[PDB]
Amino acid sequence: PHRYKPGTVALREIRRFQKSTELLIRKLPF
């Protein structure tokens, strides 16, 4: 099982967003 401990992918995924700069909110519901 390729299950990582809670938070192991969290730091990576935070890095992924804080690199990005796009719109985080879907336009139609807004």
Next chain:
DNA sequence: CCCTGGAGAATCCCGGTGCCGAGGCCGCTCAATTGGTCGTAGACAGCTCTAGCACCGCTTAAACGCACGTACGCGCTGTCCCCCGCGTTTTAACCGCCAAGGGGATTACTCCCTAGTC
């Protein structure tokens, strides 16, 4: 007791082709310079006047050490509860299908506006 070979998987990175738009080029174009005025407002004293610099001696009011003392931030213990990674499902926009008006241009019939001579 704790370290790692192997493996799974995310990262860094440069080819490697397609695209749309940044920048250059063209044609106006309108607003900053500039001539003058004439009179406005601030620089230049100038008289004034007004609060502060330093000084004096007190007065106990705060400031600091010493000693008691005591309880709280922090670090130890344990459990427990609840949120995540992954697996399965369902709203959620997007692009095709159809037959009918709306309309904007677009051209055809024609009809009056225009203008000639026996």
